[PDB]
RNA sequence: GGUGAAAUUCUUGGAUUUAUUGAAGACUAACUACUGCGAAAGCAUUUGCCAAGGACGUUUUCAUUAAUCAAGAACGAAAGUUAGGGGAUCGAAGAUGAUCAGAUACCGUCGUAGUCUUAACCAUAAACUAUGCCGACUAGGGAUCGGGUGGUGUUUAUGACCCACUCGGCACCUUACGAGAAAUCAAAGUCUUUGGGUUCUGGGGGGAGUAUGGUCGCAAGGCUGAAACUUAAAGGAAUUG
């Protein structure tokens, strides 16, 4: 009746400055008409993207990131890291029979006025010179590794605002820390965190927002 | 310089439909189902009709001028079949055949934990 | 007397002149004597203190809520009810409240309301067991008891009933134009049988 | 006008109610090296030229 | 020496009113007249001048509570809900 | 038949037979 | 007559385990009785990798794989999978193929 | 939408899907097995508290205190009852659309009680290993859970893996000298070459768990229970069609 494809404006995004190439997405809003236009229309389109296009490599084909926009300016914006989550492929590719599963979850308040709920995940591989089929734990081992993983993870929180925590998570040094801390228990398997989520955006803070570009 | 969209395919039983959208997913663009292209009420899930509708969807998308797409397949999901439909492959086939770049494939059929007792009763749906 | 809900005498310090102003709040559940109480927008959240529902999160539970800002309390005072808030639209600062067994209402965000369920729950379940307690109860309220029927009563007291037999001969299911004058018996009753008639059935 | 041409190379098997549907793993001549499985009605010899109205369609089993 | 078998406290009414009625009245009246324990007085000396209130003898610190119990299940659960909500909005 | 519905029939007949005894005695 | 050695399924020293539904027939069965298999084939039809590579950047990208788990009920399993029965003694074998 | 096919229902008052979320409850999916615990019924999220458990180690301790069991009691799946919380899902009745000679049945869409929790009841099941408890002996073999002991063994001085043995347990393959009517049995064996202690239960099939009493339960019903009365077989295993 009106053919609505010619009633929107082609936009672009800008990731934070603590990553590689940022011009990674482009979307639509509305024409610059009246009655509350694109300048104040969306103001909150959450967007998904994997880490391959954000790091330049491809080994990060999992652990996709969800980003949130808040402020718009000069036909541009700047987004804050909202969270991340694994690809569904790797989960059911990793999980297999005749082994164990270990998990944990903690909700913490960082140094600054943010909160975050973090998850964990791990398995138990059989080492060399082994003939068993299962390689299971003893139920006290799981209780010990659970609390030590919880506390050694919380030690990274209470300090390191989420800005620097993003660059601490990108190289995955915390997994090597977990390995070094818990090698006394098992021969370990691929340790991951698999989920961060937030539920208390404390305030705007346009200063720290605009501090991530240039 | 490639502009990205998101397919977000829903491939359930007895029909199938798609709609391209922005990377955020706030503005769906060009939604087409089997009913848009065939009226018989049985072959709504036919992969032939699925491809016939995907061709028109790709044409309407190229009219706006979109290049790359992220395909995200989803079956009926939940406490149901947990299996994509028959047209789930012919959709991708026709979409890639109709001049459009594909990248970053993934499934998003949401696996649930055990809850919400499925229908059919204890004895289940019997013929 | 009369109202089955208890009440409590509260005291504040007037800000404009040296005086201790007393007031009568309805006694919600969980409060005790000698207790400190808060009021206003900057108050915390502990059962008993009153806040404006505009400045409290989604999913609280309040009683004695106001309908317009300044009515000084005008909704849900009886013994055995409360109300939950669902919506929060800051622009045109209204808010959706779910009166969960009969309505969904919109109220100005600055309206008054106290957190905490009203006291006296489960009161009605106790059977009266005899006419004397009903008599004493309605004594401290109204002269609308003992009730007496009209249709079964004489024809002069009810034209559509009375006489040798107990006849009716009228109709109950009235159209959208529920006129008056026939206001004896039923009025605008359409459906029958007790079932879950609402949105979001099961 | 996708009046495509294809040379039946290898008769695969036979299906159908009467056993009257001959399968083939054919590849079309113009820009070859792209294979698809078709189901012809009548008997087809080797290196048998053939025409097609459809561009892509796969139907393995047929009773 | 069992003064009765099945009727207990509500046997004063005699034969009138029925069975289920006075049984329900028993199951409510035992709770109505039970002697609970005030949290901030230590002892158990709560009595009633009228429904809705529970007055502790020693300490004299009364409480505006339920109809026939110091705390209904609705009160007990909404207290926990408000606790969760306060902790969420604060911390 | 099945013992399920056999027992059902007999148990209903039990109540039916005992019904008239109340009206009698 | 006691047909099979194990009465119904792998259950000794538990009495009761847990119920679970079928996907095809939706019958309710104990978790230990019926069928527990996996489907880890591919997210693709007849090849089409030529088309994918020619019409997609990032050549092949991931080598994608499908993932599912199946609990076929007792009747639906034998209906779909056409094997069902075995000899009076061959039932004792436990070969996957 | 939904089914084998269609129909019922919704649908320009924007339909299911699609992004921000926000609410009510049910549960702990994949890990999840010839694994574990419990007297059974049963028991799968993490964390704290509460007291209890079998196995293992013992050059500790008391010295027959023991096995089973009438009468007596505890515990007891689901459904159901009494009065409160919520009713998201599913869902006997019920309402409807299909199919059918008929279909209040299978199938499709809704849908009350129920489907959880609190305080009392009910004591039933193919409550299955259809194999009662305690104690000795008789064949072989490999895995596996827990505890324990050795190795001039492997990985960071402790944890983890391997090799030999041992105590207890869910179990498993072979062989059966033996038993059984056979299916099969490591006990269903150590039986006319008839006897280690001990409780309960049955004497052809139906009448029949029937009314009769008694007893427990507001109630669904629960426990004990021969007859009068008709009959020739019913019944278990396995062989050939
Ligand atoms: Zn006191
Ligand atoms: Zn199924």
From Swiss-Prot, chain B:
One GO biological process from the UniProt record?
A: translation
Q: Which GO terms describe its molecular function?
A: RNA binding; small ribosomal subunit rRNA binding; structural constituent of ribosome
Which intervals carry biased composition (Basic residues)?
118-127
Alphabetic keyword roster: Cytoplasm, Nucleus, Ribonucleoprotein, Ribosomal protein, Ribosome biogenesis, rRNA processing
Q: Where in the cell is it found?
A: Cytoplasm; Nucleus, Nucleolus
GO CC annotation, single = cytosol
> InterPro entries this protein is in?
Ribosomal_uS11, Ribosomal_uS11_CS, Ribosomal_uS11_sf
Chain segments carrying region Disordered: 107-127
So what family is this one in? Belongs to the universal ribosomal protein uS11 family.
User: Any other comment in the entry?
Assistant: Present with 3370 molecules/cell in log phase SD medium. There are 2 genes for uS11 in yeast.
How does this protein assemble? Component of the small ribosomal subunit (SSU). Mature yeast ribosomes consist of a small (40S) and a large (60S) subunit. The 40S small subunit contains 1 molecule of ribosomal RNA (18S rRNA) and 33 different proteins (encoded by 57 genes). The large 60S subunit contains 3 rRNA molecules (25S, 5.8S and 5S rRNA) and 46 different proteins (encoded by 81 genes). uS11 interacts with eS1 forming part of the mRNA exit tunnel. uS11 interacts with snoRNA U3. uS11 interacts with MPP10. Component of the ribosomal small subunit (SSU) processome composed of at least 40 protein subunits and snoRNA U3.
- Which HAMAP family would you find in this protein's record? Ribosomal_uS11
What this protein is called in its record is Small ribosomal subunit protein uS11B
Curated annotation (Swiss-Prot), chain C:
Keywords, comma-separated and alphabetical: Cytoplasm, Isopeptide bond, Phosphoprotein, Ribonucleoprotein, Ribosomal protein, RNA-binding, rRNA-binding, Ubl conjugation
Q: Where is this cross-link: Glycyl lysine isopeptide (Lys-Gly) (interchain with G-Cter in ubiquitin)?
A: 42, 68, 94
User: For this UniProt entry, what's an example GO CC term?
Assistant: cytosolic large ribosomal subunit
Give the highest taxon in the source lineage.
Eukaryota
Specify where it is mainly localized.
cytoplasm
One GO MF annotation is: structural constituent of ribosome
| Location(s) in or outside the cell | Cytoplasm
Name the residues that span the membrane.
none
Task: According to the UniProt record, list the residues that bear Phosphoserine.
Answer: 1, 44, 108-109, 198
Q: Name one GO biological process term.
A: ribosomal large subunit biogenesis
Assigned protein family: Belongs to the universal ribosomal protein uL2 family.
Provide the assembly information.
Answer: Component of the large ribosomal subunit (LSU). Mature yeast ribosomes consist of a small (40S) and a large (60S) subunit. The 40S small subunit contains 1 molecule of ribosomal RNA (18S rRNA) and 33 different proteins (encoded by 57 genes). The large 60S subunit contains 3 rRNA molecules (25S, 5.8S and 5S rRNA) and 46 different proteins (encoded by 81 genes).
- What is known about what this protein does? Component of the ribosome, a large ribonucleoprotein complex responsible for the synthesis of proteins in the cell. The small ribosomal subunit (SSU) binds messenger RNAs (mRNAs) and translates the encoded message by selecting cognate aminoacyl-transfer RNA (tRNA) molecules. The large subunit (LSU) contains the ribosomal catalytic site termed the peptidyl transferase center (PTC), which catalyzes the formation of peptide bonds, thereby polymerizing the amino acids delivered by tRNAs into a polypeptide chain.
Q: Additional info?
A: There are 2 genes for uL2 in yeast.
* Protein name, UniProt field: Large ribosomal subunit protein uL2A
Q: Give the taxonomic lineage as stored in the record.
A: Eukaryota, Fungi, Dikarya, Ascomycota, Saccharomycotina
Full-length numbering of the shown residues: 52 to 253 of 254
Curated annotation (Swiss-Prot), chain E:
Residues modified to Phosphoserine: 39
Keyword Cytoplasm present in the record's keywords: the answer is yes
Instruction: State whether keyword Lipid metabolism applies.
Output: no
Q: Name one GO cellular component term.
A: cytosolic large ribosomal subunit
Q: Return the InterPro entries for the record.
A: Ribosomal_eL37/eL43 (IPR011331), Ribosomal_eL43 (IPR002674), Ribosomal_protein_eL43 (IPR050522), Ribosomal_zn-bd (IPR011332)
Example of a GO MF term: structural constituent of ribosome
Q: Which GO terms describe its biological process?
A: cytoplasmic translation
Could you list this entry's UniProt keywords, alphabetically sorted.
Cytoplasm, Metal-binding, Phosphoprotein, Ribonucleoprotein, Ribosomal protein, Zinc, Zinc-finger
Q: Where are the zinc fingers (C4-type)?
A: 38-59
Give the UniProt subcellular location, in the record's own words: Cytoplasm
Q: Quaternary structure per UniProt?
A: Component of the large ribosomal subunit (LSU). Mature yeast ribosomes consist of a small (40S) and a large (60S) subunit. The 40S small subunit contains 1 molecule of ribosomal RNA (18S rRNA) and 33 different proteins (encoded by 57 genes). The large 60S subunit contains 3 rRNA molecules (25S, 5.8S and 5S rRNA) and 46 different proteins (encoded by 81 genes).
Q: Which family does it belong to?
A: Belongs to the eukaryotic ribosomal protein eL43 family.
Q: What does this protein do?
A: Component of the ribosome, a large ribonucleoprotein complex responsible for the synthesis of proteins in the cell. The small ribosomal subunit (SSU) binds messenger RNAs (mRNAs) and translates the encoded message by selecting cognate aminoacyl-transfer RNA (tRNA) molecules. The large subunit (LSU) contains the ribosomal catalytic site termed the peptidyl transferase center (PTC), which catalyzes the formation of peptide bonds, thereby polymerizing the amino acids delivered by tRNAs into a polypeptide chain.
UniProt miscellaneous comment = Present with 44600 molecules/cell in log phase SD medium. There are 2 genes for eL43 in yeast.
Q: What is this protein called?
A: Large ribosomal subunit protein eL43A
Species the sequence originates in: Saccharomyces cerevisiae (strain ATCC 204508 / S288c)
């Amino acid at each position: 009746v009106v053919d609505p494809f010619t009633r929107k404006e082609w936009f672009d995004i800008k990731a934070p400055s603590t990553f590689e190439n940022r011009n990674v997405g482009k979307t639509l809003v509305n024409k610059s008409t009246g009655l509350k236009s694109a300048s104040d229309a969306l103001k909150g389109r959450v967007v998904e993207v994997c880490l391959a296009d954000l790091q330049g490599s491809e080994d990060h084909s999992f652990r996709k990131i969800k980003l949130r926009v808040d402020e718009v300016q000069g036909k541009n914006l700047l987004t804050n890291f909202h969270g991340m989550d694994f690809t569904t492929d790797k989960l059911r590719s990793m999980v297999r029979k005749w082994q164990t599963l270990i998990e944990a979850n903690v909700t913490v308040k960082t140094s600054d006025d943010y909160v975050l709920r973090i998850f964990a995940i791990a398995f138990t591989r059989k080492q060399a010179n082994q003939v068993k089929r299962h390689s299971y734990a003893q139920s006290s081992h799981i209780r010990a590794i659970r609390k030590v993983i919880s506390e050694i993870l919380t030690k990274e929180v209470q300090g390191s605002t989420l800005a620097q925590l993003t660059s601490k998570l990108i190289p995955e040094v915390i997994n090597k820390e977990i390995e070094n801390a818990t090698k006394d228990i098992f021969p370990l398997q691929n340790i991951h965190v698999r989920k961060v989520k937030l539920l208390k955006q404390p305030k705007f803070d346009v200063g720290a927002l605009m501090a991530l570009h240039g | 310089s490639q502009v990205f969209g998101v397919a977000r395919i829903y491939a359930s039983f007895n029909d199938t439909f798609v709609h391209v959208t922005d990377l955020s997913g706030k503005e769906t663009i060009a939604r087409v189902t089997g009913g848009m292209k065939v009226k018989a009420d049985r072959d709504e899930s036919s992969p032939y009709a699925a491809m016939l509708a995907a061709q028109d969807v790709a044409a309407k998308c190229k009219e706006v001028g979109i290049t790359a797409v992220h395909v995200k397949i989803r079956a009926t999901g939940g406490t149901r079949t947990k299996t994509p439909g028959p047209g789930g492959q012919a959709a991708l086939r026709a979409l890639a055949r109709s001049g459009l770049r594909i990248g970053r494939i993934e499934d998003v059929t949401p696996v649930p934990s055990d809850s919400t007792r499925k229908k059919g009763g204890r004895r289940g749906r019997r013929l | 007397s009369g109202r089955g809900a208890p009440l409590a005498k509260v005291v504040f310090r007037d800000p404009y002149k040296y005086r201790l102003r007393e007031e009568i709040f309805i006694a919600n559940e969980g409060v005790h004597t000698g207790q400190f109480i808060y009021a206003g927008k900057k108050a915390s959240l502990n059962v008993g203190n009153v806040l404006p529902l505009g400045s409290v999160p989604e999913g609280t539970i309040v009683s004695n809520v106001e309908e317009k800002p300044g009515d000084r309390g005008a909704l849900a005072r009886a013994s055995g009810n409360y109300v939950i808030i669902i919506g929060h639209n800051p622009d045109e600062n209204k808010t959706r409240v779910r009166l969960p067994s009969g309505a969904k209402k919109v109220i100005s965000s600055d309206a008054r309301g106290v957190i905490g369920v009203i006291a006296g729950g489960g009161r009605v379940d106790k059977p009266l067991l005899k006419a004397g307690r009903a008599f004493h109860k309605y004594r401290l309220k109204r002269n609308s008891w003992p009730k007496t029927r009209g249709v079964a009563m004489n024809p002069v007291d009810h034209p559509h009933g009375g006489g040798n037999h107990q006849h009716i001969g009228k109709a109950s299911t009235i159209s959208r134009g529920a006129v008056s004058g026939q206001k004896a018996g039923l009025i605008a009753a359409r459906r029958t049988g007790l079932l879950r008639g609402s949105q979001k059935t099961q | 006008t996708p009046v495509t041409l294809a040379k039946v190379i290898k008769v695969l098997g036979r299906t159908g109610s009467r056993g009257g549907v001959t399968q083939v793993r054919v590849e079309f001549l113009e820009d070859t090296s792209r294979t698809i499985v078709r189901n012809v009605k009548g008997p087809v010899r080797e290196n048998d030229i053939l025409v097609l109205m459809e561009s892509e369609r796969e139907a393995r089993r047929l009773r | 020496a069992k003064r009765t078998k099945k009727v207990g406290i509500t046997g004063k009414y005699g034969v009138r009113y029925g069975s289920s009625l006075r049984r329900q009245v028993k199951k409510l009246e035992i709770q109505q007249h039970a002697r609970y324990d005030c949290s901030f007085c230590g002892k158990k000396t709560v009595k009633r001048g009228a429904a809705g209130i529970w007055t502790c003898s020693c300490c004299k610190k009364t409480v505006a509570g339920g109809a026939y119990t110091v705390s209904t299940a609705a009160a007990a659960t909404v207290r926990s809900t408000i606790r969760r909500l306060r902790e969420m909005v604060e911390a | 038949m099945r013992a399920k519905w056999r027992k059902k029939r007999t148990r209903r007949l039990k109540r039916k037979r005992r019904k008239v005894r109340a009206r009698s005695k | 007559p006691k047909k099979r050695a194990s009465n119904g399924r792998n259950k000794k020293g538990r009495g009761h385990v847990k119920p679970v539904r079928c996907v095809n027939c939706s019958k309710s069965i104990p978790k230990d009785k019926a069928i527990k298999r996996m489907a880890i084939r591919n997210i693709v039809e007849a090849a089409a990798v030529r088309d994918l590579s020619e019409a997609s950047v990032y050549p092949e990208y991931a080598l994608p794989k499908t993932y599912n788990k199946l609990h076929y009920c007792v009747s639906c399993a034998i209906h779909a999978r056409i094997v069902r029965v075995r000899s009076r003694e061959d039932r004792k074998n436990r070969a996957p193929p």
